């Protein structure tokens, strides 16, 4: 793979994200690195409002621009939602909104915190010579003490990383159809299936590191956006950059490329059909790093893996293909059980129906791609 910013070890995750910005930006970093303290003491907003305007010119390399997106995105979430009890701000001040927006357009991303900010670039190893294991990793930024952001972000990232070993096989699949190399393709499909079955075990770590109460009542709040949100009905005013309010959705794993790229690979047309679910997933591509968007665009322009398998009358190939679809169905089914525990039941003490019907649509579409099954 080329300049699609895909890493052979960590996949769509940003490799070795840097922890520190230039000294020109310490006033940003001191805020972001102390969000728990400043929100609780009610000092955050005042200190945001006391900021001067830094130019984004001293952010020269891609890594530091990503880190700055993660810093200004967390600060914005904290500024907008405050202590997370519903007393919101509807105006982002000039002095953070301008640099945040100039940086976001520079990177072809919206000026709101997205998946690629707070998962893909929000991590580090404690010990660089150890393995990419939960025990040896940590997030860069959290919102509140006890918000379980570390567990939530890291377990997502560890799933993202487990998918990386299946991504590096994609080149093999397309090369094999182009060369009409059936046995080579069959093995490639089985290797992808195996990797997706291994990513299921990674999901099991969510239970040991995320608490439903804290997740539902705290973390969810700081991850909300201002699209179709009754609390900022017309959106957020990015003061000094746009005279008008604007709506952007909060962080959503529909912005993640790991599952979409396998949907594309397997010919699971998740974005066809006119439903709300297809609409949502297509909309969320604008919240992906443009290089990953372009990678997904490259997958779609390739010949259909599915139609190739269906056209060969080859039971071995159809079973290898179905192994991949079954593995995807298995992930989304377990994931649905997660949502039941972490959203549905906390909501009822001790809305979600729309969210789960979305996931259920995505799952059933996946399940309908199975072959000689029906």
Contact residues: ligand HEM, CB under 6 A: 152, 155-156, 159-160, 203, 206, 210, 215, 252-254, 256, 259, 332, 335, 338-339, 342-343, 355, 358-359, 362
> Residue 251 interacts with ligand 5PK (CB under 6 A)?
yes
> Residue 253 interacts with ligand 5PK (CB under 6 A)?
yes
DSSP 219: I
Residue 324 interface partner, choices ligand HEM, ligand 5PK, none, CB cut-off 5-8 Å depending on type: none
> Residue 64 interacts with ligand 5PK (CB under 6 A)?
no
- Annotation-wise, does 207 bind a ligand? no
Q: How far is the CB of 119 from ligand 5PK (least distance, A)?
A: 5
**Binding ligand 5PK by CB under 6 A: which of 25, 79, 81, 115?**
115
356, 336 Cβ separation under 8 angstroms: yes
- Which residues have a Cβ under 8 Å from the Cβ of 198 and sit 6 or more positions away? 162, 165
Q: How far is the CB of 220 from ligand 5PK (least distance, A)?
A: 4
Q: How far is the CB of 180 from ligand HEM (least distance, A)?
A: 32
C-alpha span between 162 and 40 (Å, rounded): 36
> Residue 365 interacts with ligand 5PK (CB under 6 A)?
no
Q: How far is the CB of 110 from ligand 5PK (least distance, A)?
A: 14
Structure-token pair, residue 262? 């396998």
C-alpha span between 282 and 293 (Å, rounded): 11
> Residue 156 interacts with ligand 5PK (CB under 6 A)?
yes
The residues pairing with 245 across neighbouring beta strands, listed in sequence order, are: 237
**Ramachandran bin of 265, using left for φ above 0, alpha for ψ from -120 to 50, beta for the remaining angles:** alpha
Q: How far is the CB of 272 from ligand 5PK (least distance, A)?
A: 22
**Helix (H, G, I), strand (E, B), or coil: what is residue 217?**
helix
Q: How far is CA 65 from CA 19, 20, 99, 220, 252, in A?
A: 12, 11, 11, 26, 21
Q: Which residues bind ligand 5PK (CB under 6 A)?
A: 115, 118-119, 153, 156, 220, 223, 251-253, 343
């Amino acid at each position: 793979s080329k300049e699609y910013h895909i890493d052979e070890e960590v996949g769509f995750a940003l490799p070795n994200p840097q922890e520190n910005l230039p000294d020109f930006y310490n006033d940003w970093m001191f805020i972001a690195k102390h969000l728990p303290d400043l929100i609780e003491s009610g000092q955050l907003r005042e200190r945001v409002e006391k900021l001067n305007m830094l130019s984004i010119d001293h952010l020269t390399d891609h890594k530091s621009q990503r880190l700055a997106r993660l810093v200004l995105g967390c600060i914005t979430m904290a500024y907008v939602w405050g202590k997370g009890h519903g007393d919101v701000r509807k105006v982002l001040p000039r002095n953070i909104a301008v640099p945040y927006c100039q940086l976001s357009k520079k990177l072809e991303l919206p000026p709101i915190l997205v998946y690629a900010d707070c998962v893909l670039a929000n991590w580090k190893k404690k010990d660089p010579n150890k393995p990419l294991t939960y025990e040896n990793m940590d997030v860069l930024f959290s919102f509140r003490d006890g918000d379980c952001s570390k567990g939530f972000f890291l377990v997502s990232l560890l799933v993202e990383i487990a998918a990386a070993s299946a991504i590096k096989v994609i080149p093999t699949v397309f090369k094999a159809m182009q060369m009409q190399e059936r046995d080579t393709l069959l093995k490639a499909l089985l290797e992808i299936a195996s990797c997706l079955e291994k990513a299921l075990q990674v999901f099991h770590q969510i239970h040991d590191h995320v608490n439903p109460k804290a997740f539902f009542s705290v973390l969810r709040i700081y991850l909300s956006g201002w699209k179709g949100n009754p609390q900022l009905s017309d959106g957020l005013v990015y003061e000094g950059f746009w005279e008008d309010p604007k709506e952007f959705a909060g962080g959503s794993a529909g912005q993640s490329s790991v599952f979409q790229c396998f949907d594309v690979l397997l010919g699971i047309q998740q974005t066809a059909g006119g439903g709300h679910a297809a609409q949502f997933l297509q909309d969320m591509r604008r919240y992906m790093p443009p290089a990953h968007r372009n990678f997904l665009c490259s997958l779609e322009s390739n010949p259909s893996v599915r139609e190739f398998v269906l056209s060969k009358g080859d039971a071995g190939l159809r079973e290898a293909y179905d192994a991949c679809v079954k593995a995807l169905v298995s992930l989304r089914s377990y994931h649905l059980q997660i949502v039941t525990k972490y959203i549905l039941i906390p909501a009822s003490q001790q809305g979600g129906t729309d969210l789960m019907n979305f996931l259920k649509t995505v799952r059933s579409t996946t399940e309908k791609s199975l072959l000689k099954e029906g």
